[PDB]
Every structure is written in structure tokens, then in C-alpha cells.
């Protein structure tokens, strides 16, 4: 096939794999229970992304959805990725500020809706309705971000400055990166079809890698992960 976006798929696979091994090696060396917890979660994130990026590279997770009078290429493998990686990243932040189970349940649930409606919209055949689902998915993300910024930040204040300061960084990187996904979707192949798939793939890999490996490097190198 040799699609124009394969090189970015290959780069995403490479970066996710390397980040996975590094976390794995670093994680199985630590003896602290709590640290192990964070390491197990943070290592699984890029591991899942690696498998999906590899699959897409190999030609899977791609489907032609008709709308706008075209046969549009929609990489659904991404949602198979985010469905598990998104909530896991949320869990890392939750464990960091000692969030409550109710909060975590609510966040993971909102994340489920976000990815769920997102995929449904990316698969919808009625052009205008694709944006209705997109809208609902974004509303769910805003809820998540609101909770992360107003709820979590507040409880991170009961933690030590080192833990609070580590969370602020992860929170910030998360808010900035996550906020970009809906925009890319809107102007990309799933939406207006303004930005070509090759470039679109480039944008998503940069966001995915930064939100997983970048997020992990920051979290796993901090002393805030220790019990």
C-alpha cells in the first residue's frame, strides 16, 4: 500500500516501543510498592499504543467511511488505543493526588463516553451528525479537564509540595495535549478534511508520544511516586 502517513506510523511505533522498554526496565528495578504501582500503569500505556501503531503500520485499524461524497480513510485503531490508555493516564493522576474512588469512577466513565462517542462520530455516515457526536465527546473531555484542574489540583494541596508540583506539571501537559485532539479531529480526515491524513497522522503521533512517553518520563523520574 505505502500510504503517505506510514513514516509517522513507523515513528510512533518506534517511540512507543522504546519508551515502553525503558519504563519496564526502570519499573522492575524499583522495590517500592507504590512506585511499582505507577510504573506498571505508566508502562502499559505506551505498550498499548505500540501495539496499535504497529497494527496501523501493518495495515490494520483502517476503514473507509463514506460521507461528503468521498470514501474517507478512518483509522479506528486509535480509539482501541485511547479507550485503555486515556483512563490509565487519568488513573496515574488520580493515584498521585489520592483522589476518591467516586471521582475515579466518574473520570473513567466520562473518558469512556469521550472515546465511545468519538469513534461513533468517526464512523457516522451522515456528515453533519459526525459533528454531533464530536460535540458530545468534546463535552465529555471538558468535564474531565475541569475535574483535573479544579478537583484534583485542590486535593493535590493535601500532598507534599514535591507531589503537588509533580501533579501540576502532569496536569498542565495533559490539559494542553488533550485539548489539541478535538481540534485535530475537527480539521482532519474525520472532520472538515482540511488537513491531509499524512499531516494529521503526524500531529497525532506528536500528541500521543508527548502525552504518553513525555508524561511518563516526567512522572517516573519524580520522587512523588514513592509510598
Rounded Cα distance, 158 and 98, in Å: 9
Quote the CA–CA distance of 75 and 61 in Å, as a whole number. 5
Binds ligand RET by CB under 6 A, chosen from 12, 19, 182, 214: 182
Q: Which residues contact 77 (CB under 8 A, 6 or more apart)?
A: 52, 55, 56, 60, 61, 62
Find the length of the chain.
227
Is residue 86 near ligand RET by the rule CB under 6 A?
A: yes
Which is nearer to ligand RET, 85 or 222 (by Cβ)? 85
Stretch that binds ligand RET, among 14-22, 25-33, 63-71, 174-182 (CB under 6 A): 174-182
| 10 Cβ contact list (under 8 Å, min separation 6) | 57
Identified binder of ligand RET from the candidate list 9, 89, 99, 202, rule CB under 6 A: 89
- Cβ distance 208 to 12 under 8 Å? yes
* Residue 164 C-beta: closest distance to ligand RET, Å: 22
Site for ligand RET contains 27 (CB under 6 A): no
Helix (H/G/I), strand (E/B), else coil: 70: strand
Q: DSSP secondary structure string, 169-204?
A: HHHHHHHHHHHHHHHHHHHSTTTT--S-HHHHHHHH
Angle between helices 6-27 and 33-57 (to 10 degrees): 160
User: Which among 59-67, 110-118, 146-154, 218-226 is the span making contact with ligand RET, rule CB under 6 A?
Assistant: 110-118
Binder among 212, 222, 224, 225 for ligand RET (CB under 6 A): 212
Residue 211 makes contact with ligand RET by CB under 6 A: yes
- Contacts with ligand RET, 121-150, as mask; x by CB under 6 A: -------------x--xx--x---------
Find the part of the chain contacting ligand RET (CB under 6 A) among 68-76, 82-90, 96-104, 146-154: 82-90
Q: Is 82 in the site for ligand RET (CB under 6 A)?
A: yes
Binding residues for ligand RET, rule: CB under 6 A, are 49, 82, 85-86, 89, 114-115, 118, 134, 137-138, 141, 178, 181-182, 185, 208, 211-212
Amino acid at each position: 500500500t505505502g500510504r503517505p502517513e506510514w513514516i509517522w506510523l513507523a515513528l510512533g511505533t518506534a517511540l512507543m516501543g522504546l519508551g515502553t522498554l525503558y519504563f519496564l526496565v526502570k519499573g522492575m528495578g524499583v522495590s517500592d510498592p507504590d512506585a511499582k504501582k505507577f510504573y506498571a500503569i505508566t508502562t502499559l500505556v505506551p505498550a498499548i499504543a505500540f501495539t496499535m501503531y504497529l497494527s496501523m503500520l501493518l495495515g490494520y485499524g483502517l476503514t473507509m467511511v463514506p460521507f461528503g461524497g468521498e470514501q474517507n480513510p478512518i483509522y479506528w485503531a486509535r480509539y482501541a488505543d485511547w479507550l485503555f490508555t486515556a483512563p490509565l493516564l487519568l488513573l496515574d493522576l488520580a493515584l498521585l493526588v489520592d483522589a476518591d474512588q467516586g471521582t475515579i469512577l466518574a473520570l473513567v466513565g466520562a473518558a469512556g463516553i469521550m472515546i465511545g462517542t468519538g469513534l461513533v462520530g468517526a464512523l457516522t455516515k451522515v456528515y453533519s451528525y459526525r459533528f454531533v457526536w464530536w460535540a458530545i465527546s468534546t463535552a465529555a473531555m471538558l468535564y474531565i479537564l475541569y475535574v483535573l484542574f479544579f478537583g484534583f489540583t485542590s486535593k493535590a494541596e493535601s500532598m507534599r509540595p514535591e507531589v503537588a508540583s509533580t501533579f501540576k506539571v502532569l496536569r498542565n501537559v495533559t490539559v494542553v495535549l488533550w485539548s489539541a485532539y478535538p481540534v485535530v479531529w475537527l480539521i482532519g480526515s474525520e472532520g472538515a478534511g482540511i488537513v491531509p491524513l499524512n499531516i494529521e497522522t503526524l500531529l497525532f503521533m506528536v500528541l500521543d508520544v508527548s502525552a504518553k512517553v513525555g508524561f511518563g518520563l516526567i512522572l517516573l523520574r519524580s520522587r512523588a511516586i514513592f509510598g
